[PDB]
Structures are given as C-alpha cells and as structure tokens.
Amino acid sequence: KPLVGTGIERNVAVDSGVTAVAKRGGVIQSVDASRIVVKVNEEELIPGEAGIDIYNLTKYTRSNQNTCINQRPCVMPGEPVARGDVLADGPSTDLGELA
C-alpha cells in the first residue's frame, strides 16, 4: 500500500475489475490460491437456489504488455464477508487498495 495516499485507491481497485468482489455476502466456506467458495446468508438467498458462490481466480496469466496478472486470496475460511467486500487482490492491489 502507499503510506501517503489520497483516499481514491479503493475506488480504482474495486472498479477496475482486477479484484474479486463478493456478489453476495456470507461466510467463506473454502479458500485456496485458485478458488473462493462463499456460503450466502439466508436473508439474501433467491428461493430455490443452491445458496453458494464460486470465484475462480486468475493465476499467472499474461497481460497485453507481457506482464503478470495474478489474483491472490485475501480472506480466511470462516471469515464473514458482505456484499462489495474484496475477496482476492489483483495485480497492484493490497487489501482492496491500489498499490
């Protein structure tokens, strides 16, 4: 992270799409360097749905400028997560902040 920043980094990191943001809140059922599976809350589940969300993370994929695109998990198994929370950090991101 930048020690001296402006308070805009979170917006750029979230809206760039490089990070993995939670579509629905819940508890992180499974964490691994390539997968995040979250159990959605009861209150926000669609009727007759599986109730669980799967996030597959991009690992060491070439970019247009021959750089590295890597997504690293930033959560724990069992950690409560809400909608809009960052689950994985993409390139140049640290806990949801541009780096």
């Binding site: 964490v31 691994d32 360097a33 390539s34 690992k59 060491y60 890597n70 690293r72 998990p73």
Partner: peptide, 14 residues
C-alpha cells in the same frame, strides 16, 4: 514456482 497447490492458500512463489 508459478503454480498453485490444492489446500494451500499461498502460491509456491510466496
């Protein structure tokens, strides 16, 4: 090193 192992949260680089 640029790989992942199941059940391990950190990449081999890490």
């Amino acid at each position: 090193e640029y790989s992942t192992k199941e059940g391990v949260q950190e990449d081999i680089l890490e």
